[PDB]
Amino acid sequence: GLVPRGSHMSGATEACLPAGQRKSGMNINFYQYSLKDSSTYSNAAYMAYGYASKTKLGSVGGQTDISIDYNIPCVSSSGTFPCPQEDSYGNWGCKGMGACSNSQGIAYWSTDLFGFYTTPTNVTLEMTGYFLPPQTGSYTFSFATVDDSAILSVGGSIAFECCAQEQPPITSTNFTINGIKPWDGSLPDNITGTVYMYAGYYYPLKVVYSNAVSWGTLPISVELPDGTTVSDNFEGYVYSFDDDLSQSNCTIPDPSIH
Ligand SMILES: [Cl-]
Ligand SMILES: [Cl-]
Ligand SMILES: [Gd]
């Protein structure tokens, strides 16, 4: 037929065409989160939107390197250096540093999260922007591991509303990757979510990440339709647009027929 039939039962992921000035990178908003609170971040509502009802600490924009790798200090015989989690041992030392005199259970202050001075031991952050597929097809997003709790959402009315990136979070819990810290135990590594995307449309993207204590980890990747993998540095794929709530045509509910 003259036209494609469209994804079945309106199943295409909603995307956007913002007409404003495109900016490289994602916006990162930071919110208060309590040290050693292992329960708040176990709730879907909290991870989708509830985080923004706590105190906003600040923000940084234009971030293209979006992976989290936060290692606590080891106060060692030779000075204070960050300890890779896999190198921590005993009660406690860090391999190649000897015994550490400092507690694993207190808050620590650092700029390791996107240059923003905060407590990476205990914080919640929201990354927002738009993913621009250069290729039409299936994209598979993944978290290699999660310390401590995280979601990733893709699409208009899932991540956020088109042309409304800067607005209070929407209530959708239809996560693309659910890496929420379980109540009982934890969850596997390399948790994944797949989205079919049309080249040249802007797909809203939200990552919400939380840490309660010590090490923070969120290695973010995407597998492209060509089978190659982009890890950590999403330069060329992620962008921000200032809100334009007046741009009437901004939402594309079905890019499969637009
Ligand atoms: Cl350090
Ligand atoms: Cl050692
Ligand atoms: Gd942690």
Side-chain angles (χ1 to χ4, degrees), residues 1-4 6-8 10-183 185 187-258:
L2 206 85
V3 297
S7 303
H8 300 104
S10 204
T13 299
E14 180 171 284
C16 316
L17 293 167
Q21 178 57 246
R22 190 183 78 172
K23 296 165 285 139
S24 186
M26 301 183 75
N27 184 77
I28 318 291
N29 284 331
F30 292 85
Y31 302 87
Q32 183 278 323
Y33 193 88
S34 303
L35 187 73
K36 287 174 290 189
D37 175 355
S38 71
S39 74
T40 296
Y41 62 21
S42 279
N43 300 289
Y46 173 83
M47 291 306 281
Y49 59 94
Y51 59 90
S53 68
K54 313 304 194 76
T55 300
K56 183 176 172 182
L57 308 172
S59 62
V60 301
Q63 298 302 300
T64 50
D65 259 73
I66 62 173
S67 282
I68 290 154
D69 188 17
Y70 166 70
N71 294 328
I72 60 174
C74 172
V75 179
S76 87
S77 62
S78 68
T80 302
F81 300 92
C83 189
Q85 191 170 185
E86 65 278 8
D87 289 3
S88 62
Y89 67 96
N91 259 335
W92 68 291
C94 188
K95 211 288 167 168
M97 319 191 182
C100 309
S101 64
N102 60 304
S103 174
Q104 294 191 6
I106 63 174
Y108 288 104
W109 280 260
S110 167
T111 53
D112 284 345
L113 303 178
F114 309 101
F116 179 74
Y117 188 66
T118 189
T119 47
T121 49
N122 61 292
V123 68
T124 291
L125 55 87
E126 174 206 74
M127 318 189 190
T128 54
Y130 298 80
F131 187 90
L132 180 63
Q135 294 172 0
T136 290
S138 188
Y139 289 72
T140 296
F141 292 86
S142 66
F143 292 157
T145 189
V146 183
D147 293 307
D148 293 351
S149 187
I151 62 82
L152 183 150
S153 288
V154 182
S157 313
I158 299 187
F160 56 82
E161 308 297 346
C162 296
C163 279
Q165 184 187 341
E166 304 182 83
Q167 294 291 306
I170 62 170
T171 61
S172 175
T173 55
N174 184 18
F175 312 116
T176 304
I177 307 171
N178 186 332
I180 296 173
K181 170 80 79 198
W183 301 94
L187 38 41
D189 285 350
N190 298 252
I191 321 176
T192 73
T194 63
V195 188
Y196 198 89
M197 282 182 281
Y198 298 89
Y201 292 91
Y202 288 92
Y203 286 80
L205 170 64
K206 179 175 70 182
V207 178
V208 179
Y209 163 81
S210 193
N211 197 22
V213 73
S214 62
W215 288 272
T217 328
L218 196 75
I220 305 174
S221 303
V222 68
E223 190 192 325
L224 310 180
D226 71 9
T228 69
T229 293
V230 179
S231 295
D232 318 307
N233 178 19
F234 280 62
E235 190 175 31
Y237 296 98
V238 296
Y239 299 93
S240 296
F241 292 93
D242 289 353
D243 282 356
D244 185 353
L245 309 193
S246 78
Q247 195 198 313
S248 296
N249 68 6
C250 190
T251 301
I252 312 296
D254 188 347
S256 81
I257 64 168
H258 174 83

PDB file of all heavy atoms in Angstrom, residues 41 85 120-121 147-148 181 209-217, ligand 3:
ATOM      1  N   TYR A  41      14.048   4.355  48.105  1.00  0.00           N
ATOM      2  CA  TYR A  41      14.341   4.137  46.688  1.00  0.00           C
ATOM      3  C   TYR A  41      13.894   2.773  46.139  1.00  0.00           C
ATOM      4  O   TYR A  41      14.185   2.432  44.987  1.00  0.00           O
ATOM      5  CB  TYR A  41      15.815   4.445  46.380  1.00  0.00           C
ATOM      6  CG  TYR A  41      16.876   3.615  47.077  1.00  0.00           C
ATOM      7  CD1 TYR A  41      16.610   2.352  47.616  1.00  0.00           C
ATOM      8  CD2 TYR A  41      18.167   4.096  47.162  1.00  0.00           C
ATOM      9  CE1 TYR A  41      17.618   1.605  48.234  1.00  0.00           C
ATOM     10  CE2 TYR A  41      19.170   3.365  47.772  1.00  0.00           C
ATOM     11  CZ  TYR A  41      18.900   2.128  48.302  1.00  0.00           C
ATOM     12  OH  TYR A  41      19.919   1.424  48.893  1.00  0.00           O
ATOM     13  N   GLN A  85      35.532  -0.596  44.297  1.00  0.00           N
ATOM     14  CA  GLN A  85      34.775  -1.462  45.198  1.00  0.00           C
ATOM     15  C   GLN A  85      35.367  -2.885  45.272  1.00  0.00           C
ATOM     16  O   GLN A  85      35.435  -3.486  46.353  1.00  0.00           O
ATOM     17  CB  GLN A  85      33.305  -1.499  44.760  1.00  0.00           C
ATOM     18  CG  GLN A  85      32.387  -2.151  45.759  1.00  0.00           C
ATOM     19  CD  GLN A  85      30.922  -1.980  45.436  1.00  0.00           C
ATOM     20  OE1 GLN A  85      30.074  -2.382  46.231  1.00  0.00           O
ATOM     21  NE2 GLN A  85      30.605  -1.379  44.287  1.00  0.00           N
ATOM     22  N   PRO A 120      27.912  11.897  47.060  1.00  0.00           N
ATOM     23  CA  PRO A 120      27.554  10.780  46.171  1.00  0.00           C
ATOM     24  C   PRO A 120      27.192   9.479  46.885  1.00  0.00           C
ATOM     25  O   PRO A 120      26.599   8.590  46.276  1.00  0.00           O
ATOM     26  CB  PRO A 120      28.791  10.600  45.295  1.00  0.00           C
ATOM     27  CG  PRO A 120      29.453  11.979  45.294  1.00  0.00           C
ATOM     28  CD  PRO A 120      29.271  12.388  46.774  1.00  0.00           C
ATOM     29  N   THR A 121      27.569   9.394  48.155  1.00  0.00           N
ATOM     30  CA  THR A 121      27.153   8.302  49.060  1.00  0.00           C
ATOM     31  C   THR A 121      25.647   8.271  49.286  1.00  0.00           C
ATOM     32  O   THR A 121      25.073   7.235  49.631  1.00  0.00           O
ATOM     33  CB  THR A 121      27.796   8.488  50.449  1.00  0.00           C
ATOM     34  OG1 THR A 121      27.578   9.840  50.889  1.00  0.00           O
ATOM     35  CG2 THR A 121      29.297   8.226  50.394  1.00  0.00           C
ATOM     36  N   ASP A 147      24.340   0.319  41.727  1.00  0.00           N
ATOM     37  CA  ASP A 147      24.532   0.619  43.150  1.00  0.00           C
ATOM     38  C   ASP A 147      24.039   2.052  43.315  1.00  0.00           C
ATOM     39  O   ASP A 147      24.753   2.954  42.882  1.00  0.00           O
ATOM     40  CB  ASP A 147      26.017   0.577  43.558  1.00  0.00           C
ATOM     41  CG  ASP A 147      26.645  -0.823  43.483  1.00  0.00           C
ATOM     42  OD1 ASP A 147      26.096  -1.783  44.066  1.00  0.00           O
ATOM     43  OD2 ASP A 147      27.726  -0.952  42.858  1.00  0.00           O
ATOM     44  N   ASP A 148      22.861   2.319  43.878  1.00  0.00           N
ATOM     45  CA  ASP A 148      21.942   1.342  44.487  1.00  0.00           C
ATOM     46  C   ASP A 148      20.627   1.083  43.762  1.00  0.00           C
ATOM     47  O   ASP A 148      20.187  -0.064  43.710  1.00  0.00           O
ATOM     48  CB  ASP A 148      21.592   1.754  45.924  1.00  0.00           C
ATOM     49  CG  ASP A 148      22.774   1.678  46.884  1.00  0.00           C
ATOM     50  OD1 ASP A 148      23.865   1.151  46.550  1.00  0.00           O
ATOM     51  OD2 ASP A 148      22.598   2.210  48.000  1.00  0.00           O
ATOM     52  N   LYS A 181      16.047  -1.106  43.352  1.00  0.00           N
ATOM     53  CA  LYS A 181      16.587  -2.003  44.378  1.00  0.00           C
ATOM     54  C   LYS A 181      15.433  -2.794  45.014  1.00  0.00           C
ATOM     55  O   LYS A 181      14.516  -2.195  45.571  1.00  0.00           O
ATOM     56  CB  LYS A 181      17.354  -1.187  45.428  1.00  0.00           C
ATOM     57  CG  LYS A 181      17.778  -1.946  46.689  1.00  0.00           C
ATOM     58  CD  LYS A 181      19.031  -2.776  46.460  1.00  0.00           C
ATOM     59  CE  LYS A 181      20.293  -1.919  46.507  1.00  0.00           C
ATOM     60  NZ  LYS A 181      21.467  -2.608  45.879  1.00  0.00           N
ATOM     61  N   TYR A 209      18.505   7.989  39.297  1.00  0.00           N
ATOM     62  CA  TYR A 209      19.502   7.183  39.971  1.00  0.00           C
ATOM     63  C   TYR A 209      19.584   7.551  41.451  1.00  0.00           C
ATOM     64  O   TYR A 209      19.532   8.738  41.797  1.00  0.00           O
ATOM     65  CB  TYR A 209      20.876   7.399  39.312  1.00  0.00           C
ATOM     66  CG  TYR A 209      21.998   6.931  40.219  1.00  0.00           C
ATOM     67  CD1 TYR A 209      22.338   5.583  40.291  1.00  0.00           C
ATOM     68  CD2 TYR A 209      22.689   7.844  41.028  1.00  0.00           C
ATOM     69  CE1 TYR A 209      23.353   5.137  41.150  1.00  0.00           C
ATOM     70  CE2 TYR A 209      23.705   7.413  41.887  1.00  0.00           C
ATOM     71  CZ  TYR A 209      24.027   6.069  41.937  1.00  0.00           C
ATOM     72  OH  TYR A 209      25.021   5.652  42.792  1.00  0.00           O
ATOM     73  N   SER A 210      19.707   6.543  42.319  1.00  0.00           N
ATOM     74  CA  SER A 210      19.825   6.799  43.748  1.00  0.00           C
ATOM     75  C   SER A 210      20.893   5.942  44.430  1.00  0.00           C
ATOM     76  O   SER A 210      21.125   4.776  44.079  1.00  0.00           O
ATOM     77  CB  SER A 210      18.462   6.618  44.438  1.00  0.00           C
ATOM     78  OG  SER A 210      18.514   7.146  45.751  1.00  0.00           O
ATOM     79  N   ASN A 211      21.539   6.556  45.414  1.00  0.00           N
ATOM     80  CA  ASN A 211      22.503   5.873  46.277  1.00  0.00           C
ATOM     81  C   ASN A 211      22.182   6.181  47.738  1.00  0.00           C
ATOM     82  O   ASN A 211      21.794   7.320  48.059  1.00  0.00           O
ATOM     83  CB  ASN A 211      23.937   6.287  45.922  1.00  0.00           C
ATOM     84  CG  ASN A 211      24.982   5.315  46.493  1.00  0.00           C
ATOM     85  OD1 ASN A 211      24.671   4.156  46.784  1.00  0.00           O
ATOM     86  ND2 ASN A 211      26.204   5.785  46.668  1.00  0.00           N
ATOM     87  N   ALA A 212      22.320   5.160  48.593  1.00  0.00           N
ATOM     88  CA  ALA A 212      22.058   5.269  50.029  1.00  0.00           C
ATOM     89  C   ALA A 212      23.325   5.233  50.866  1.00  0.00           C
ATOM     90  O   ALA A 212      23.364   5.853  51.930  1.00  0.00           O
ATOM     91  CB  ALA A 212      21.081   4.186  50.513  1.00  0.00           C
ATOM     92  N   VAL A 213      24.341   4.514  50.402  1.00  0.00           N
ATOM     93  CA  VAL A 213      25.589   4.408  51.176  1.00  0.00           C
ATOM     94  C   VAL A 213      26.773   4.050  50.265  1.00  0.00           C
ATOM     95  O   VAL A 213      26.593   3.427  49.209  1.00  0.00           O
ATOM     96  CB  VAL A 213      25.427   3.375  52.328  1.00  0.00           C
ATOM     97  CG1 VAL A 213      25.412   1.939  51.782  1.00  0.00           C
ATOM     98  CG2 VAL A 213      26.498   3.552  53.420  1.00  0.00           C
ATOM     99  N   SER A 214      27.973   4.433  50.694  1.00  0.00           N
ATOM    100  CA  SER A 214      29.222   4.034  50.020  1.00  0.00           C
ATOM    101  C   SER A 214      29.221   4.102  48.470  1.00  0.00           C
ATOM    102  O   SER A 214      28.888   5.151  47.893  1.00  0.00           O
ATOM    103  CB  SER A 214      29.740   2.681  50.554  1.00  0.00           C
ATOM    104  OG  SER A 214      28.833   1.613  50.308  1.00  0.00           O
ATOM    105  N   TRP A 215      29.598   2.999  47.815  1.00  0.00           N
ATOM    106  CA  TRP A 215      29.875   2.992  46.377  1.00  0.00           C
ATOM    107  C   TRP A 215      28.617   3.268  45.572  1.00  0.00           C
ATOM    108  O   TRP A 215      27.501   2.852  45.952  1.00  0.00           O
ATOM    109  CB  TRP A 215      30.519   1.674  45.927  1.00  0.00           C
ATOM    110  CG  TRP A 215      31.956   1.535  46.400  1.00  0.00           C
ATOM    111  CD1 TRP A 215      33.077   1.977  45.751  1.00  0.00           C
ATOM    112  CD2 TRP A 215      32.415   0.933  47.623  1.00  0.00           C
ATOM    113  NE1 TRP A 215      34.204   1.674  46.485  1.00  0.00           N
ATOM    114  CE2 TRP A 215      33.825   1.036  47.636  1.00  0.00           C
ATOM    115  CE3 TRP A 215      31.769   0.310  48.702  1.00  0.00           C
ATOM    116  CZ2 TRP A 215      34.608   0.547  48.695  1.00  0.00           C
ATOM    117  CZ3 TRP A 215      32.560  -0.185  49.759  1.00  0.00           C
ATOM    118  CH2 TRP A 215      33.954  -0.065  49.737  1.00  0.00           C
ATOM    119  N   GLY A 216      28.834   4.031  44.501  1.00  0.00           N
ATOM    120  CA  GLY A 216      27.764   4.345  43.539  1.00  0.00           C
ATOM    121  C   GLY A 216      28.182   3.843  42.172  1.00  0.00           C
ATOM    122  O   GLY A 216      29.316   4.076  41.754  1.00  0.00           O
ATOM    123  N   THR A 217      27.274   3.159  41.469  1.00  0.00           N
ATOM    124  CA  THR A 217      27.626   2.586  40.167  1.00  0.00           C
ATOM    125  C   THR A 217      26.427   2.545  39.231  1.00  0.00           C
ATOM    126  O   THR A 217      25.366   2.058  39.610  1.00  0.00           O
ATOM    127  CB  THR A 217      28.218   1.152  40.258  1.00  0.00           C
ATOM    128  OG1 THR A 217      28.960   1.013  41.483  1.00  0.00           O
ATOM    129  CG2 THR A 217      29.145   0.897  39.082  1.00  0.00           C
TER     130      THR A 217
HETATM  131 GD    GD B   3      25.794   2.214  47.394  1.00  0.00          GD
END
